[PDB]
Subunit: 379 residues, 2 copies
């Protein structure tokens, strides 16, 4: 019952789903569509199972396009998936049909964005290894954009570089700022945010739906989709809101916490501070909007702690099927009740409530993107 406190799928309820446009399939009830997706997924109503599975077989690791967020007010939505398996030549009808079907849930807009979170160069590299990205020729009325966020290896490097600098024996400012710049860390934070802001404007301003993918659709995809949601919707700026976004977009959707956070092996090329960057992105917004969020800096820092402590079950393993196999929902407890106990210590006292802010328009002029002391004092 501790576990019934935060149910990711209720959030779909909150955006008026199911409806004329979107339904919740249990088709993945036994992980038959995709082994790293949740049992329940949301796809367009107008699509058959055969089209979903056929798309699945054209997406990397079967991570088929699936809804992440719907903006009630204008019906624009954000979807997420892995990269396509197109190479230089291959097309797939069921795939092309599924993206065609997503855009049709927003008849208003004449085109749909396909946002690729990667740099063009990396997308090209993956295309040469039999993967790649969608072609504007084979996908009717799409507008392809690269976001340019680097991969997990570059991120692990960047953080390693920054901590090495921060631990220097009595350094000057010029030494420190030189090292900060070298690490690239704030470039990476700034990139993720900018990609968030791009998608936000796509959805709010242009009223256009967006399909987001990275390579595997579970690192940069989770970051940038989450950030966009926090930008669009006040709900995710609340205790329950954020608790929910994390269970939905990170935990259930199969960000590999056990591998990324080193629960079993810390010396692996699979370790990377991807969830850290996401919390950092929320921190940046809090700094820029001292009144917009219900929670304070401490909330994020405690969440970050238990992502690593393994004190709770929420973040164990690398997907929902893993967690089900670990019997985690029966034999362990959930963070969220535990953190709800401690809300007194987590409340932003400058918070101006739910109805105050709508969509946030931060600036990412670099003097706004700052080193986060409270965080790079826990490493």
């Amino acid at each position: 019952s501790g576990w019934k406190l935060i149910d990711p799928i209720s959030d779909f309820g909150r955006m008026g789903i199911p409806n004329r446009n979107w339904t919740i399939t249990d088709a993945n009830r036994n992980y038959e569509i995709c082994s790293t997706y949740p049992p329940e997924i949301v796809v367009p109503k107008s699509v058959t199972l055969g089209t979903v599975v056929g798309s699945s077989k054209f997406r990397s690791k079967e991570r088929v396009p699936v809804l992440s967020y719907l903006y009630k007010e204008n019906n624009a939505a954000i979807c997420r998936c892995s990269q396509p398996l197109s190479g230089f030549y291959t097309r797939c009808v069921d795939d092309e049909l599924l993206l065609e079907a997503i855009s049709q849930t927003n008849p208003g807009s004449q085109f749909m964005y396909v946002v690729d979170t990667r740099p063009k160069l990396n997308a090209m590299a993956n295309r040469a290894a039999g993967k790649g990205y969608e072609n504007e020729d084979n996908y009717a009325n799409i507008r392809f954009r690269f976001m340019g966020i680097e991969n997990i290896h570059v991120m692990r490097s960047s953080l390693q570089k920054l901590l090495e600098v921060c631990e220097l024996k009595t350094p000057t400012m010029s030494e420190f700022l030189s090292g900060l710049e070298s690490s690239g860390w704030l470039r990476h934070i700034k990139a993720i945010m900018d990609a968030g802001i791009f998608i936000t404007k796509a959805v709010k301003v242009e009223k256009a739906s967006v399909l987001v993918h990275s390579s595997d659709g579970w690192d940069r995809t989770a970051q940038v989709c989450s950030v966009a949601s926090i930008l669009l919707d006040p709900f995710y700026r609340t205790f329950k809101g954020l608790m929910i976004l994390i269970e939905k977009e990170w935990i259930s959707m199969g960000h590999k916490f056990s591998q990324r956070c080193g629960h079993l092996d810390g010396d692996s090329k699979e370790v990377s501070p991807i969830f850290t960057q996401f919390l950092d992105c929320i921190w940046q917004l809090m700094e820029q909007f001292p009144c917009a969020f219900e929670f304070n800096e401490n909330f994020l820092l405690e969440i970050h702690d238990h992502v690593f402590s393994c004190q709770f079950g929420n973040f164990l393993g690398n997907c929902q099927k893993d967690r089900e196999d670990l019997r985690v929902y029966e034999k362990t407890h959930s963070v969220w009740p535990f953190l709800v106990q401690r809300k007194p210590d987590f409340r932003n006292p400058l918070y101006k409530g739910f109805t105050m802010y709508g969509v946030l328009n931060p600036s990412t002029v670099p003097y706004n993107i700052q080193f986060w002391c409270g965080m790079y004092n826990r490493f």
Copy 2:
């Protein structure tokens, strides 16, 4: 009548003065000892009038050693002055004696500190111009220390570089970071803080009294003395406290606000962000101690706003005499009352009260000395 709300001398009372070691002399009542000092001033009890004037004539601008702050618990004190007129060889019994009287108001410590805020190369250039600095060989148990804080033309050039960076058209994170390093601004605010922390640790840990001087004793001497004061005493972290600190150490002691803040001539080589740097240092402490200060970021910024707006009277003129002779007391209003009526907007919700903190112990590792958006968004 609002011109009486904040009275500087009252702060001497608060530290228990007059007493067995310190008095308020009337000697400068008609500004005949020092023209740029205020009418009342604090010197040791054991000192004669003849020694005070004798010393003043061996100090640049006649800005003789006077008391800045007495740490009651310790009897260790902080005095301030201008550089001595000792050149290469000349000495002065009167100046030597007045420094020994200062140290003999704190008999517990076998030595007194003398703190030169300048880098030694500057102090040497001043020596070659017939001024300079004290020789440990000519003075009673002094340990002489350079703080390395650069001059006003450097500070001016620095802020000027920094703003040029910030208003660059869409800079990469790298361009900004490299420009922030080049401007040197954070190097300067760190040095100031480090000077403050040096003094602070002298008084608290070693129970050693400190004489602080620069060249003219009214820019760097004010920054450093003030920062050490905030670090030692909670009183200056309250609303009234800081208004008193600014009246006492900055306005009454003759920091040339009009020349500095560009009231008269903005093109002047005399313009320099000295007070700006000071508010920055307070904010840096507020960020490291979000519960220690009664006021918030806005209190500093509004204060700063008016120092430049010339809407009230308090920062007009370059010292007390200028101020009295222009009759500003009579012709405009004080800022301080005007700010008390707006305290709702200045309060720090996380303030844990007066007795919760003692001597603050900040870190000046370059990563927690940060760029202040609030401030360089006003320029």
